[PDB]
Amino acid sequence: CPLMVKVLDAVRGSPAINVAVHVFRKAADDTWEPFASGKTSESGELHGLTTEEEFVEGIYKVEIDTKSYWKALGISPFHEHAEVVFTANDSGPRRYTIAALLSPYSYSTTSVVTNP
Amino acid sequence: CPLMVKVLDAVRGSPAINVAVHVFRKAADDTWEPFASGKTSESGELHGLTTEEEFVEGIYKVEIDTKSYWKALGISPFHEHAEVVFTANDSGPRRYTIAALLSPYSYSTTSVVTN
Amino acid sequence: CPLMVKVLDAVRGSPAINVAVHVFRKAADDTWEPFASGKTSESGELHGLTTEEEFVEGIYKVEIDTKSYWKALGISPFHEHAEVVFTANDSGPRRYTIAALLSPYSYSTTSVVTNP
Amino acid sequence: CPLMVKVLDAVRGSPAINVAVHVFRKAADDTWEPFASGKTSESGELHGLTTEEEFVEGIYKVEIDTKSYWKALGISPFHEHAEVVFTANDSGPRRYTIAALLSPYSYSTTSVVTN
């Protein structure tokens, strides 16, 4: 798949399991249209959100529901979510891995972009 | 004084200067209405965005325009911007510092809530 | 293998290839004895440093040669290396993934620890 | 004044207070000789470690004792400490700020070199 999301828990040193992820795409009228969604697995990875055909050029927003994750563990975190906004496929199809590392008052995100 | 934004450049080891910062507040219809904005200083810091009187409880979004920062430096970035969305709560007096550490394909954000 | 090291490049959004890694173990006399070494592959991962039998309890230091990495790309970075120092296997054997994300003036490291 | 250390807690969103910090300088025999040390303040900062006169070119190691910080809070940490090893260079006047953001199983360190 051309898009994978991986989430890690910096407090426990583990994948972040069952984290809800919503992906949006900017439409012609500059509104965020729903594009794909899912939940991270036991490995902290969410595969299969999209296909090469559906994943056209555009501006995408990956919304990782960090608050609900921490709340279920009893922590009141700072952020409502972690959002990753980027232009995709504007130089041809690529493969994207969006990684997020989560702490109650911090998060970091990095992207690994490869060419098939 | 209740809200401060600080941006750092991890490629150059320096403050990220002249980074545009836009703050929004979530309206009742769940839209993002403009609230405050500015540009980071020589020290990478942006002070005086809001006041105690105006910074009521609610959900705020801080948008750091990281793409134009890297483009001015001639470095290809991944992100359109960095986004920090949080709930301001009054539980005692509190000051919010949102720090962001920028790399072309990565950013980290952390918030220090004190006093 | 019970120990894997993964290195990512935050400037290019890619694995950090050919990064030298040296692992040390604190001996009885508190000196760092050489334990294992290797280079990250095309995926940024270094596998096979050790075995379950050799990877006893102890204090280990993972030295990632970040400076040489950036220098070969023409960048003069801040750090001489990134070092990850931790006690291992003190509650029984575990599996450890040491991840490092590199920028010229910054690095972050996180560990994923799992129980077989 | 040429060297400042700042430590932050990503679990609590706060300065990391009373964190022991040990600085070493690499001797000619490549051993680590003690150079300066202290504890972080209420603001998570440690100032006045060294002076311009004493902070000559050379390789320095800054050791942040993160394990005792988390143990005092009753949280199991991964690392023994966080280590920052760098070359001090005189190429113009420069000030070094080593910042560290701490989580139980993760830390990030960044250095701002200015002026």
Q: Is the dihedral of CA B83, B2, D104, C15 positive or negative?
A: positive
- HEC letters along B42-58: CCCEECCCCCCCCCCCE
Q: Region of A89 please: left (phi>0), alpha (psi -120 to 50) or beta.
A: left
Query: CA C33 to CA D36: how far, in whole Å?
Result: 26
* Phi, then psi, of D36 in degrees rounded to 5: -155, 160
For residue A57, the domain's CATH number is: 2.60.40.180
Q: Tell me the chain D residues in contact with residue B10 when contact means C-beta distances shorter than 8 Å.
A: 110
Looking at the structure of chain A, the number of domains it has is: 1
D43: DSSP letter: T
Distance CA(D30)–CA(D37), nearest Å, equals 20
**C-alpha span between B71 and D59 (Å, rounded):** 34
Count of CB contacts below 8 A, B vs C?
A: 39
* Gap between the Cα atoms of D96 and A69, Å rounded: 37
Tally Cβ neighbours within 10 Å of residue D52: 11
Q: Under an 8 A CB cutoff, do C110 and D112 touch? A: no
- Are A88 and A60 spatial neighbours (Cβ–Cβ below 8 Å)? yes
Give C-chain residues touching D81 at CB under 8 angstroms.
Answer: 85
Please judge whether B9 and C101 are an interchain contact, meaning their C-beta atoms are less than 8 angstroms apart. Answer: no
Q: Give the Cα separation of C6 and A3 in Å (integer).
A: 20
E runs forming strands in chain D: 3-9, 14-15, 20-26, 32-39, 45-46, 58-64, 79-88, 95-103, 106-114
How far is B61 from C86, CA to CA, in rounded Å?
Answer: 37
Q: Are B102 and B80 in contact (CB under 8 A)?
A: no
Cα–Cα distance measured from residue D40 to residue B45, given in angstroms and rounded to the nearest whole number = 22
Instruction: Please report the beta strands in A43-105, taking only residues with DSSP state E, as ranges in sequence order.
Output: 45-46, 58-64, 79-88, 95-103
The rounded distance, in Å, linking the Cα atoms of D28 and B73 is 40
The span from the CA of C46 to the CA of C68, in Å, is 17
Whether the Cβ atoms of residue A64 and residue A21 lie closer than 8 Å to each other? yes
* Alpha carbon of B48: minimum distance to chain A alpha carbons (Å): 21
| DSSP 3-state of A52 | coil
Resolution in A: 1.6
Strands A79-88 vs B79-88: parallel, antiparallel or unpaired? antiparallel
Q: Which of residues 88-107 of C touch D (CB under 8 A)?
A: 103, 105-107
Domain of residue A13, residue span:
3-114
Please give the full DSSP string across chain B, using - where no structure is assigned: --EEEEEEETTTTEE-TT-EEEEEEE-TTS-EEEEEEEE--TTSEE--S--TTT--SEEEEEEE-HHHHHHHTT---SEEEEEEEEEE--SSS-EEEEEEEEETTEEEEEEEEE-
Å from C101 to nearest chain D CA?
Answer: 9
* CA-based torsion, C8, C9, C13, C14: positive or negative: negative
Our CA angle for D73, D75, D78, nearest 5°, is: 125
D74 Cβ under 8 Å from any chain A Cβ:
no
Task: Closest CB to A83: pick one of B85, B111, B113.
Answer: B85
Experimental technique of record: X-ray
Both tokens of A79, joined, read 């952020």
Main-chain dihedrals φ then ψ at residue B70, nearest 5 degrees: -70, -35
